[PDB]
Every structure is written in structure tokens, then in C-alpha cells.
Write a protein that binds this DNA or RNA. Sequence first.
RNA 1: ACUCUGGUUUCUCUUCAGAUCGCAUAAAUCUUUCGCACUAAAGAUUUCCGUGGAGAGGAACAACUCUGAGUCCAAUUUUUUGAGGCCUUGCUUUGGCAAGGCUA
Length: 33
Amino acid sequence: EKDDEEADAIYAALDKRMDERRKERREQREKEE
RNA sequence: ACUCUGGUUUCUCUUCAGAUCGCAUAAAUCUUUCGCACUAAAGAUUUCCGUGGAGAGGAACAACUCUGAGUCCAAUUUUUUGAGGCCUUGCUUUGGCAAGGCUA
């Protein structure tokens, strides 16, 4: 639903906010590995 | 001994951090080793608990402590006198200079 989709977008933004802590280095190591 | 910066507290955001980033110490995955892997070790990657540095914004009272900066000597030994005057020679830039001999 509209509220449900807004909530899912908000929570996805929350989750992507968090791995940003090591996002650059984690993604670089994963690409190298 | 006169004037001027810089504050501190709190909330949020951005970046770097191998520094006991933490006087503490978790979990997962992969590899290797041997056992035969909770009762085991090594290496690597990740995630989490949560920190320092710098920068940026917001909002609350302290504003010159501190950090800095700009702002009483006359008696030996130094700054309260042994100072001034005469003579010769070389050159006179004819003012006298240079050395020596003197008198005080």
C-alpha cells in the first residue's frame, strides 16, 4: 500500500544508511576478492 | 601598571582515522593445518557494540582568570671626565691631518 511502500522506502534508506559505515572499503575489498 | 582576540555547554551533519582508534574485547564467512572442531590453532574478509581528529551548521550563557598580542644608578670597573695647552717632521685639502717629544 501507499503507507506500506513509504515505510519500505524509509526502512531501506535506514538500512543503506548503516552499511555506509564501511561501504566504500567493504565494496572495494569485495570487488578485489 | 592601559586596550584587543580566543570561550564553555548542547544538538545535528560531513570526512579521515592500524592510534591500547577500546587500559575493553563479540559474532559470521572463506582458506590452511592437523585432529577424527564448542570442548583447536593459524591467515584473511565482513558485520556489529562505540570512540578519536578535522570541518560545517544550529542554540544556551560567560564574556577578559587564563592563552597570548597590541602597550629607584655623580666619588675607581663602562653613562656625570685628566679633560685641555706647547714643540718637530711628511703632506698642506694653508683648515690642519699623521707620528713622536712635552706642560698640566
